[PDB]
Amino acid sequence: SLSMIKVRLQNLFDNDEVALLKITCYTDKLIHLTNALAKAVIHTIKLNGIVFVHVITSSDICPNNNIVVKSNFTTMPVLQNGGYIWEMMELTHCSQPNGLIDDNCEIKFSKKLSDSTMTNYMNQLSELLGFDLNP
């Protein structure tokens, strides 16, 4: 009853920096996870061993954080402490969802903010980076 997804990512401020996000969830929740990620901005925070992955989605259903059974975040190179925003380059559904995964990050789902200050921030950032964060 478990499914596994891996998402390949590249840093919008430095395309040489890449990351892999692996998530396991119950198969009946998989559709909510993929729909959420399809309409999502990916923002991460790192302070030493503590890593937070923010999935900020414009999907109709923003899933509950409890749909994640395990999550792993690995980067190349190893990143300095700080905050990051990522482009999703690839999404893969994996055979053998029960395989080993080192649980080393916390996933936080939230809804995109309709507030005009945040909208203006996301639109100007989109123009700076040449990538539409608010399509």
Give residues in contact with Cl ion (CB under 5 A). 35, 59-60, 120-121
Rounded-to-integer distance, Cα 80 and Cα 96, Å: 32
User: Smallest distance, Å, CB 43 to Cl ion?
Assistant: 16
User: Smallest distance, Å, CB 60 to Cl ion?
Assistant: 5
User: Which residue lies nearer to Cl ion by CB, 66 or 120?
Assistant: 120
Is 2:24 a contact under the CB 8 Å cutoff?
yes
User: Whose structure tokens read 């996870």?
Assistant: 33
User: Which residue lies nearer to Cl ion by CB, 15 or 134?
Assistant: 134
User: Smallest distance, Å, CB 78 to Cl ion?
Assistant: 31
User: Which residue lies nearer to Cl ion by CB, 59 or 75?
Assistant: 59
